[PDB]
């Protein structure tokens, strides 16, 4: 079968990119290669009645406009989230947390004063653009550096702020590749804003917003969608002319397709899988990002260790986990006083295995060393009198008791069940991606969003988070998107 435009990816640069292209008429198919959900890195499970978010969770709908409008225009309500968060250094540094030490750092690399918040929110991405291909620190322009060697230029930051943003896990959890300063110092800049706070969730979990769209979709008679197909092959029908064959894998086996255009809407990882399909000039760029590990792990237990309103805790240097959530049912509506716990594991995860893990399933092996790392935060806060982690007096008095193999082993029986989402395994490779050092990431943007095989026809395209001028977020994937929608012509009359 024949297609007008073929779509491969269900995320949401894939469904968006369908949805724009739907209704400006044009008939097309759209391939996801899982069988069994749609929506990519956006995934949503039921976990013993909580909400458990593997992917996004919390929005900022001002930094993130095109997202937010794309909430309002599919019915899909954002809800403000309320809840919790979070003496040797010279005169200038004493004073602040680890990201205003970031900040300051940045702010002397642009040759701003750090205080300077008025220019931070004014900073638009035409400024973002001017910053990218024209800042340099020392005469070496920032694209061409790692932000570590950015940050360790001369006149930024004391020696000795450097090893504390060390210590504080600046380069262990946040910045963890030393990658593009450019991009970098641009992601910080726009985090850094006055109206970059407002925080919202969506309601119903952020797979409402998948399925709000595939429901429009499904309205719309010029689309097919098709689960359990991925795309593993394509080039010209013939050389020189425009029209493309694809080989398309299926569970039970596989399809041979022909369309005038194609939609890439997939990241770094299934895009190196289909390297030696590409045109040359695109898949030797395939490397201009990296993809940042993350291991997102849910558990509810059946007798939690904290009450409601307990506060997120982030964690430093040499602590695999970036940070622990807690959640406990609303204290009026609560069945059974159950409770659930996310922890996010940023560090790649076979060093976290070599480190926490004993070999004598991978995941019960995981969750095991998960309780035991969660035992020794519980014992501390018992011995310690003041801890942001309130233990009740019941927790209090028995784990002040049990000795440490005792704690994990309690923790571990209390879990009734259990989720763990590795997103660098295969097919994802990633939870997200940066751009490297040496890259000019406008040029890879610019290639990247129409190319062909040499015949000037400019009918391949790759949407996505991974290539974006905003990554780690919808917003990044909705930009990519509209850069390719803006080269696609209206439909043959
Ligand atoms: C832990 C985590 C936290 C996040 N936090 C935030 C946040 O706070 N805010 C925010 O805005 N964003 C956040 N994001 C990012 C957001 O989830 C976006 O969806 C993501 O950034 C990418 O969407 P995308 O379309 O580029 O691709 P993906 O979501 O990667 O979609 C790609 C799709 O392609 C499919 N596929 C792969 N290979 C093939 C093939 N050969 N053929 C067919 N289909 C194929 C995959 O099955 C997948 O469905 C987070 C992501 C994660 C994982």
């Known amino acids: ?283 030797s760029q395939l490397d201009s990002v990296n993809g940042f590990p993350m291991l997102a792990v849910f558990f509810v237990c059946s007798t939690p260790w904290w009450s409601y309103g307990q506060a997120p805790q982030q964690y430093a240097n040499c602590m695999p986990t970036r940070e622990i959530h807690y959640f406990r049912r609303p204290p009026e509506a609560d069945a059974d006083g159950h409770g659930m716990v996310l922890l996010y594991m940023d560090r790649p995860s076979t060093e976290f295995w070599r480190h926490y893990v004993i070999d004598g399933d991978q995941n019960g092996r995981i969750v095991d060393a998960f309780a035991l790392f969660v035992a020794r935060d519980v014992k501390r806060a018992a011995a310690s009198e003041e801890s942001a982690l309130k233990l009740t007096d019941h927790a209090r008095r028995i784990f002040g008791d049990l000795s440490l193999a005792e704690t994990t082993q309690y923790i571990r029986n209390s879990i009734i069940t259990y989720g763990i989402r590795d997103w660098a395994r295969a097919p994802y490779g990633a939870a997200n991606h940066g751009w490297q050092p040496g890259v000019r990431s406008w040029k890879v943007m610019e290639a990247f969003k129409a190319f062909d095989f040499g015949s000037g026809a400019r009918n391949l395209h790759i949407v996505g988070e991974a290539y974006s001028d905003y990554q780690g977020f919808i917003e990044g994937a909705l930009n990519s998107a509209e850069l390719a929608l803006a080269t696609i012509p209206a439909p043959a009359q």
């Open 1 to 283: 079968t024949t297609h007008d435009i073929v779509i491969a990816g269900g995320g949401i640069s894939g469904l968006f990119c369908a949805l724009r292209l739907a209704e400006a008429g044009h008939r097309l198919l759209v391939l996801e290669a899982a069988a069994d959900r749609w929506g990519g890195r956006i995934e949503t499970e039921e976990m013993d009645g909580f909400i458990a978010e593997y992917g996004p969770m919390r929005f900022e709908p001002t930094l993130q406009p095109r997202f937010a409008a794309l909430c309002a225009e599919l019915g899909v309500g954002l809800v403000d989230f309320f809840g919790p968060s979070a003496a040797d250094l010279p005169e200038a540094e004493r004073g602040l947390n680890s990201l205003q030490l970031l900040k300051r750092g940045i702010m002397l690399i642009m040759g701003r004063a750090p205080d300077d918040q008025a220019w931070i929110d004014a900073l638009t991405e035409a400024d973002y653009m001017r910053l990218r291909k024209h800042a340099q620190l020392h005469g070496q322009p920032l694209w061409a550096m790692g932000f570590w060697n950015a940050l360790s230029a001369q006149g930024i930051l004391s020696h000795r702020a450097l090893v504390k943003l060390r210590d504080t896990g600046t380069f262990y959890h946040m910045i963890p590749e030393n990658l593009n300063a450019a991009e970098w110092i641009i992601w910080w800049l726009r985090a850094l804003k006055t109206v970059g706070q407002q925080l919202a969730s969506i309601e119903g979990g952020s797979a409402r917003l998948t399925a709000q769209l595939l429901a429009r979709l499904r309205s719309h008679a010029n689309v097919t969608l098709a689960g359990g197909h991925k795309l593993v092959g394509v080039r010209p029908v013939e050389l020189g002319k425009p029209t493309l064959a694809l080989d398309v894998a299926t569970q039970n086996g596989a399809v041979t397709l022909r369309t005038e255009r194609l939609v890439l809407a997939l990241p770094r990882l299934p895009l190196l899988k289909l390297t030696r399909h590409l045109p040359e000039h695109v898949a």
